[PDB]
Amino acid sequence: LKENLTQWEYLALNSELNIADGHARQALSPGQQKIVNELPVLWAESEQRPVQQIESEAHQAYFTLLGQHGYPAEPGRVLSCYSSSVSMEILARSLSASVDRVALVHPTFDNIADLLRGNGLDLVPVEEDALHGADLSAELLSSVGCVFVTTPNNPTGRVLAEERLRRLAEQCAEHGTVLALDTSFRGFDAAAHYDHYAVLQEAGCRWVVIEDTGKLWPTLDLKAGLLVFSEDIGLPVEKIYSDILLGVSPLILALIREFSRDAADGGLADLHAFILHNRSVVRRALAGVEGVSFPDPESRSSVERVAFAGRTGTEVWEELQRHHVFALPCRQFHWAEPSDGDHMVRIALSRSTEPLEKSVQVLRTVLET
Amino acid sequence: LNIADGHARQALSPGQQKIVNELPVLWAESEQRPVQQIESEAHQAYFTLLGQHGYPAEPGRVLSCYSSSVSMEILARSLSASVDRVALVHPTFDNIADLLRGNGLDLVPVEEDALHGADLSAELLSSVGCVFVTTPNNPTGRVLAEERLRRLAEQCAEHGTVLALDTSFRGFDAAAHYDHYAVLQEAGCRWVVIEDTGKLWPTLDLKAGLLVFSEDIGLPVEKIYSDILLGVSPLILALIREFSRDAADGGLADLHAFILHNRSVVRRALAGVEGVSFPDPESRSSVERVAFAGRTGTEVWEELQRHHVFALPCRQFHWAEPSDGDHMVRIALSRSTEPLEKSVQVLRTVLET
Numbered sequence: 001l002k003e004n005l006t007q008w009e010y011l012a013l014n015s016e017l018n019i020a021d022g023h024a025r026q027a028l029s030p031g032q033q034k035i036v037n038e039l040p041v042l043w044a045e046s047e048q049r050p051v052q053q054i055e056s057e058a059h060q061a062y063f064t065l066l067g068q069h070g071y072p073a074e075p076g077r078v079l080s081c082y083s084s085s086v087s088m089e090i091l092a093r094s095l096s097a098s099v100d101r102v103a104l105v106h107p108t109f110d111n112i113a114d115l116l117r118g119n120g121l122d123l124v125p126v127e128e129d130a131l132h133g134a135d136l137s138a139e140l141l142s143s144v145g146c147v148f149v150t151t152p153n154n155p156t157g158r159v160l161a162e163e164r165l166r167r168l169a170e171q172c173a174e175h176g177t178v179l180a181l182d183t184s185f186r187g188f189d190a191a192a193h194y195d196h197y198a199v200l201q202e203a204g205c206r207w208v209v210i211e212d213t214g215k216l217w218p219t220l221d222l223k224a225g226l227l228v229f230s231e232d233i234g235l236p237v238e239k240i241y242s243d244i245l246l247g248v249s250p251l252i253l254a255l256i257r258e259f260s261r262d263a264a265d266g267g268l269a270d271l272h273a274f275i276l277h278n279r280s281v282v283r284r285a286l287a288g289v290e291g292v293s294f295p296d297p298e299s300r301s302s303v304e305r306v307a308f309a310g311r312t313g314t315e316v317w318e319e320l321q322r323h324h325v326f327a328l329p330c331r332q333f334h335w336a337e338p339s340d341g342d343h344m345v346r347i348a349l350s351r352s353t354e355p356l357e358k359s360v361q362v363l364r365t366v367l368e369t
Numbered sequence: 370l371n372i373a374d375g376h377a378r379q380a381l382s383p384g385q386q387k388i389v390n391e392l393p394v395l396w397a398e399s400e401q402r403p404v405q406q407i408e409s410e411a412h413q414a415y416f417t418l419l420g421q422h423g424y425p426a427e428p429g430r431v432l433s434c435y436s437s438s439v440s441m442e443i444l445a446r447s448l449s450a451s452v453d454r455v456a457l458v459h460p461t462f463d464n465i466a467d468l469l470r471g472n473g474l475d476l477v478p479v480e481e482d483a484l485h486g487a488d489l490s491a492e493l494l495s496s497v498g499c500v501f502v503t504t505p506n507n508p509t510g511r512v513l514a515e516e517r518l519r520r521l522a523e524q525c526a527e528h529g530t531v532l533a534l535d536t537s538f539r540g541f542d543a544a545a546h547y548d549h550y551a552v553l554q555e556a557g558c559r560w561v562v563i564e565d566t567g568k569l570w571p572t573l574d575l576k577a578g579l580l581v582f583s584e585d586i587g588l589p590v591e592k593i594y595s596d597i598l599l600g601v602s603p604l605i606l607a608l609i610r611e612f613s614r615d616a617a618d619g620g621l622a623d624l625h626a627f628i629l630h631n632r633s634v635v636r637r638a639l640a641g642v643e644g645v646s647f648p649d650p651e652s653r654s655s656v657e658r659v660a661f662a663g664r665t666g667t668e669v670w671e672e673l674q675r676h677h678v679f680a681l682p683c684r685q686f687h688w689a690e691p692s693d694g695d696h697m698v699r700i701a702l703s704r705s706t707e708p709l710e711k712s713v714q715v716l717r718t719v720l721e722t
């Protein structure tokens with residue numbers, strides 16, 4: 001009855017022990033609270049300055065924070081959207097104008113697949129081992145109009161390394177294929193902070209990148225998706241963007257600018273240490289629980305998969321919920337073969353440590369019948 | 370300056386500035402309380418402010434979207450599997466036509482005098498899967514009266530047709546504050562209403578579209594909504610709640626007087642100019658059409674742009690027959706009175722030369 005992962009996440013939104021959706025819900029740091037305290041000043045700034053200047057500063061702050069120095073800074077090359085999923089809707093409807101089939105990393109966050117399928121795109125799954133480990137086949141590339149990679153991936157944290165991004169972009173250029181990247185989790189893993197735009201521009205393929213500010217910081221879902229495209233993208237992303245929105249709030253762009261600057265001043269290192277700490281409490285709690293393992297030992301992302309022998313993630317979820325703890329079954333990240341995720345759940349790490357600790361102690365008991 | 374887009378850009382009232390000064394408190398509330406409570410309170414405040422007492426208050430029946438256009442994208446995509454043709458009021462907000470067409474729907478225009486003045490024909494209704502009405506209409510301000518909404522809903526029920534309403538301008542016109550949901554539920558057609566908080570108040574485009582649907586809508590609106598978002602920011606919902614409460618305490622009356630004053634400024638400025646008329650004398654909406662014989666709205670737009678004034682030509686609103694609008698421009702009234710007056714003074718000079 002839960003048609004997708006988001007519908008599993010609705011069930012948790014109002015619970016104290018929500019460890020389901022991946023949004024950031026931990027406490028603000030002192031530096032971030034200082035930003036919140038200045039919201040009336042930022043409001044006045046947003047009333048008084050041209051939105052284009054605030055937007056340009058927000059983009060410069062966010063891209064540079066995360067190593068993306070070669071981003072196209074000319075006005076109009078970065079389209080600020082209400083969310084990364086709104087960017088994805090724009091991209092999907094734009095692709096449907098000239099593309100029939102898309103190669104998509106599998107597993108990945110399921111709304112990517114659902115927005116593409118919903119706009120009439122046929123999907124070809126590419127497992128992570130194939131994507132990272134070998135060139136894509138000429139047969140595949142000649143059969144799709146777009147290759148779509150989430151990096152760092154959600155839910156696995158796997159990062160597309162620079163040498164493979166380079167080869168994939170060269171392959172897409174050689175075939176005339178669009179290379180599309182979803183980089184929502186970029187800020188969590190320094191392995192993703194090499195300059196992706198330099199790689200894409202050097203290879204000269206058609207490309208689109210959807211950045212997302214929303215997952216990094218606890219901003220009450222005040223965020224933007226940033227839809228960045230090559231000059232030769234040859235899809236109607238600008239026209240469809242303008243059918244959906246004029247732009248995002250200057251106050252949100254001002255907030256992104258300020259949170260990005262705080263992150264550059266030491267906040268990002270603190271965030272990495274916080275996520276590492278919370279990952280450690282999860283793994284320590286589910287330590288010698290017979291049948292438990294962690295499929296992504298090297299992940300640095302803000303979500304964590306846990307596997308179990310002998311039960312399904314749906315059953316674990318239901319016993320958890322009877323204790324008012326809400327996690328996420330993994331089936332639906334495996335959008336081409338949901339049974340691949342039948343023995344995993346996903347835990348959200350962007351949470352205050354104390355309710356996270358409480359939730360995984362409950363999971364430890366459940367997982368011990 | 371900008372008298373083009375319809376968004377609210379006037380200064381905050383003192384009551385609204387107090388809300389903004391307390392944003393850090395609203396932030397703490399949004400961290401601490403269940404979003405569902407904040408959302409229910411925001412919906413209750415907004416629907417009750419505007420007379421919509423019968424709205425479905427059960428959680429999940431009102432879907433909070435980033436914007437009304439996001440709601441419209443959801444609706445357009447949701448229609449596309451089962452509906453080939455949509456009857457759409459003409460003229461209207463051109464984004465609605467472009468979102469419907471972009472999702473594969475063919476459009477049939479319904480002129481305003483036909484929509485308001487008589488029942489729709491069986492031929493039309495049996496040939497479309499959805500009838501879409503913007504009320505109060507943008508750009509004309511024309512309000513669908515209760516008796517006509519009831520008949521239109523009854524006719525859509527009789528023909529198995531979805532009735533969809535876009536009510537973004539609702540807050541500006543008390544004629545649109547009769548309870549639309551009571552009518553829709555009593556008629557028993559499949560229906561969707563897209564409310565919008567965005568155009569009423571100068572909130573720096575912090576807003577929500579509210580996608581409301583009948584239990585039997587029979588379209589994948591909930592599924593496609595969940596493909597796009599988990600929900601809107603609790604801070605924005607809290608802001609909507611507070612601005613709605615301020616409006617209920619006298620702010621809405623002040624807004625109506627402010628819009629009336631700015632409408633009066635525009636008309637007094639242009640009253641005597643040869644060839645100028647106002648096609649919508651009873652409109653209370655936050656945009657104003659100005660008609661003028663002798664020039665095209667495109668030519669007038671061009672001339673204003675030379676003097677650094679940005680209005681809108683009306684062609685685009687006549688999405689089925691753009692020439693229907695090339696003797697009109699549209700002026701935005703949700704502006705501080707001083708820059709509006711400056712803009713209209715340039716327009717008067719342009720029209721007198």
Ligand SMILES: N=C(N)NC[C@@H](O)CC(=O)C(=O)O
Binds near residue numbers: 009023154303597598
């Ligand atoms: N359809 C959408 N947009 N769902 C919300 C999204 O933020 C969930 C997600 O990606 C996660 O929990 O990791």
Ligand SMILES: [Cl-]
Binds near residue numbers: 374375376507
């Ligand atoms: Cl408008």
